[PDB]
Scaffold this active site. Structure first.
Site, mmCIF file in Angstrom:
data_model
loop_
_atom_site.group_PDB
_atom_site.id
_atom_site.type_symbol
_atom_site.label_atom_id
_atom_site.label_comp_id
_atom_site.label_asym_id
_atom_site.label_seq_id
_atom_site.Cartn_x
_atom_site.Cartn_y
_atom_site.Cartn_z
ATOM 1 N N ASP A 8 0.836 -1.202 0.000
ATOM 2 C CA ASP A 8 0.000 0.000 0.000
ATOM 3 C C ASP A 8 0.874 1.256 0.000
ATOM 4 O O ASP A 8 1.942 1.297 0.596
ATOM 5 C CB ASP A 8 -0.966 0.013 1.204
ATOM 6 N N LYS A 68 1.072 11.291 -3.649
ATOM 7 C CA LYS A 68 -0.290 10.794 -3.842
ATOM 8 C C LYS A 68 -1.129 11.753 -4.713
ATOM 9 O O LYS A 68 -1.915 11.298 -5.567
ATOM 10 C CB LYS A 68 -0.953 10.587 -2.472
ATOM 11 C CG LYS A 68 -2.468 10.793 -2.448
ATOM 12 C CD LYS A 68 -2.988 11.160 -1.047
ATOM 13 C CE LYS A 68 -2.416 12.483 -0.527
ATOM 14 N NZ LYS A 68 -3.135 12.949 0.689
ATOM 15 N N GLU A 145 -8.129 0.978 -0.879
ATOM 16 C CA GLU A 145 -7.835 0.985 0.542
ATOM 17 C C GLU A 145 -9.008 0.441 1.361
ATOM 18 O O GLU A 145 -8.840 -0.540 2.108
ATOM 19 C CB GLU A 145 -7.516 2.400 1.022
ATOM 20 C CG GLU A 145 -6.169 2.959 0.586
ATOM 21 C CD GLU A 145 -5.839 4.282 1.298
ATOM 22 O OE1 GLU A 145 -6.687 4.760 2.096
ATOM 23 O OE2 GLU A 145 -4.737 4.841 1.070
ATOM 24 N N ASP A 167 -11.090 6.022 7.203
ATOM 25 C CA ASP A 167 -9.668 6.139 6.866
ATOM 26 C C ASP A 167 -9.138 7.300 7.691
ATOM 27 O O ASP A 167 -9.730 8.372 7.726
ATOM 28 C CB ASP A 167 -9.437 6.363 5.347
ATOM 29 C CG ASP A 167 -7.931 6.537 4.963
ATOM 30 O OD1 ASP A 167 -7.091 6.861 5.835
ATOM 31 O OD2 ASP A 167 -7.590 6.367 3.767
#
Lengths: 502, 50, 48
Positions: A8, A68, A145, A167
């Site tokens: 990840d 990201k 995710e 999250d």
């Protein structure tokens, strides 16, 4: 073959994990770090990556910080000797993650799988499989995710349902509402905050702290960065304490010194404001899907800073029930990536039953003194073997008597088997060898063998029930060994080594 | 005729399941057989650094 | 050939039982390692 390895990348949250046997596993990095993070650099002829790249970052031209934001974008960095793209930089993120999963396992992972956002679509979530294979490690699929940790845990035993994730990034928040397709995951709703999180929490600590010190001595704080480092660390401490613990303090002293008794409800009224910057993203989901807070089958806690009772006291009184905490949320994306990683290329349907042994099994020494070979709790499909010798010179034959329990005594234990064995050759005691393999199958009828060596004449037994009875009856005895708490007085027969005459 | 076909039919399904049988079937081995080596360095790491 | 089909069929079903067994003894040994190791590293880091 090869096991399919999770990686990840969460932009300041990142991990590469795996599965060995029947237990899900979170890898260690080259740094002492349980997880080393996402950002990097370069220099002349030699790359520098990770927690080792990142403090050469405020000291050297090259640092990339949370890229990201540029995955699936036309973003191009101008950097020394060639400009660079999100893909080629991430190729090295996972080149380093490759050498590191390699320098952990030794059984290489070529095949691998990724953890992306649930919001993403054909552009960027392709960028994942692509840059996933840029470093050289192929992608057998790309999870998201949220559907990821959902299946780290996993939902597919259960029924058609609904959910919302939590999250918590590194200073980012998110939640994604999901549903069951009776075997299918499709993420329904999405919400959260671009900057909110743990570091911010640390900075409300550092802020009220510094402000309070200017409140006493008049002397200001933030001008000083070993002091402020001292702050970040000690305040992080007090934080996670406030989470677990009922009371606190902070010893920060020999400052230049602040020694305070760190409070919880002051830190809470400190932090109970951004907990409604969340309820916004949350209920915005509740409308993106249309179904009220009362429409869901299960819901969860994710991220690094999610370990405090702040959000959970905002929820127990929000959606009606408690979260599934059955994880170690911090790395919870990584393992998730590989769950199906090994549901695909690997093992299939799993009982994993009669994984335990009723009792410690052993047999009749020195007139009943009981020695163990098998212990309790032991996975059933197994057998252990041991060889005694002669009681006394010239034993023409040997009887065998076996016990089950703990208490080291004869009728202070359950008589299991009694059967004998004859023809042994005459000769000095202790010498001749007789074997007994306790041979314990999976299914519960236990075989047990004893056979001379030099003979190769052998008698064994096939028992029947081993139990024949119930749980309480056993555990009442498992209790009983404890209850006796030194019937060990039979070390009295331990000094019956008087048996030796010479 | 059709009497002949179920032969490599059943045979088919069988070795078929088998392939996986084999694979997974040494998966466990290889992995445990790895982490015995793991804990095998873990004493080495706790020998100074514990 | 004719029922040698059935013969191998047998062979393989047999290696089914045989195989699964070969496994569950594995599950046994694997999961079993833990008690031991856990306690081994216990005593490792109490002292030293």
């Amino acid at each position: 073959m090869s096991k399919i390895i999770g990686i990840d990348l969460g932009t300041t949250n990142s991990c590469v994990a795996v599965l060995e046997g029947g237990e899900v596993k979170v890898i260690p990095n080259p740094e002492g770090n349980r997880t080393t993070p996402s950002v990097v650099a370069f220099k002349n002829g030699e790359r520098l990556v990770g927690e080792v790249a990142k403090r050469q970052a405020i000291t050297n031209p090259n640092t990339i910080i949370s890229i990201k934001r540029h995955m699936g974008t036309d973003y191009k960095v101008e950097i020394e000797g060639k400009q660079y793209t999100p893909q080629e930089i991430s190729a090295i993120i996972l080149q380093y993650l490759k050498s590191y999963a390699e320098d952990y396992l030794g059984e290489p992972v070529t095949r691998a799988v990724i953890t992306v956002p649930a919001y993403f679509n054909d552009a960027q979530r392709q960028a994942t499989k692509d840059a996933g294979r840029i470093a050289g490690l192929e992608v057998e699929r790309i999870i998201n995710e949220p559907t990821a940790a959902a299946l780290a845990y996993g939902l597919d035993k259960e029924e058609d349902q609904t959910i919302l994730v939590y999250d918590l990034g590194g200073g980012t928040f998110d939640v994604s509402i999901l549903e069951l397709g009776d075997g299918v995951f499709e993420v329904k709703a999405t919400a959260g905050d671009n900057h909110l999180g743990g570091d911010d929490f640390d900075q409300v600590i550092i802020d009220y702290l510094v402000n309070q010190f200017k409140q006493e001595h008049g002397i200001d704080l933030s001008k000083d960065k070993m002091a402020l480092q001292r702050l970040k660390d000690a305040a992080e401490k007090a934080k996670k304490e406030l989470s677990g613990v009922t009371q606190t303090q902070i010893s920060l002293p020999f400052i230049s010194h602040l020694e305070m008794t760190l409070t919880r409800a002051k830190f809470e009224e400190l932090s109970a404001h951004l907990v409604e910057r969340t309820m916004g993203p949350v209920r915005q989901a509740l409308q993106d899907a249309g179904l009220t807070p009362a429409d869901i089958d299960k819901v969860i806690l994710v991220g690094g800073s999610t370990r405090i009772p702040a959000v959970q006291e905002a929820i127990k009184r929000e959606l009606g029930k408690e979260p599934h905490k059955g994880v170690n949320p911090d790395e919870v994306v990584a393992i998730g990536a590989a769950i199906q990683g090994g549901v695909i290329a690997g093992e299939v349907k799993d009982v994993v039953l009669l994984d335990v042994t009723p009792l410690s099994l052993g047999i009749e020494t020195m007139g009943g003194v009981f020695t163990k070979l098998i212990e309790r709790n032991t996975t059933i499909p197994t057998s252990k073997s041991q060889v005694f010798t002669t009681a006394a010179d010239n034993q023409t034959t040997v009887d065998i008597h076996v016990l089950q329990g703990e208490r080291p005594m004869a009728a202070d234990n359950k008589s299991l088997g009694r059967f004998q064995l004859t023809g042994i050759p005459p000769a000095p005691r202790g010498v001749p060898q007789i074997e007994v393999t306790f041979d314990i199958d999976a299914n519960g009828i236990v075989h047990v063998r004893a056979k001379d060596l030099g003979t190769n004449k052998e008698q064994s037994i096939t028992i029947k029930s081993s139990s024949g009875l119930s749980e309480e009856e056993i555990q009442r005895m498992i209790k009983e060994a404890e209850e006796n708490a030194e019937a060990d007085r039979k070390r009295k027969e331990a000094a019956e080594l008087r048996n030796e005459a010479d | 005729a059709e009497e002949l076909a179920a032969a490599k039919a059943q045979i088919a399904e069988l070795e078929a399941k088998l392939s996986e049988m084999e694979h997974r079937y040494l998966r466990l081995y290889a992995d445990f057989e790895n982490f015995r080596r793991r804990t095998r360095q873990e004493m080495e790491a706790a020998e100074k650094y514990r």
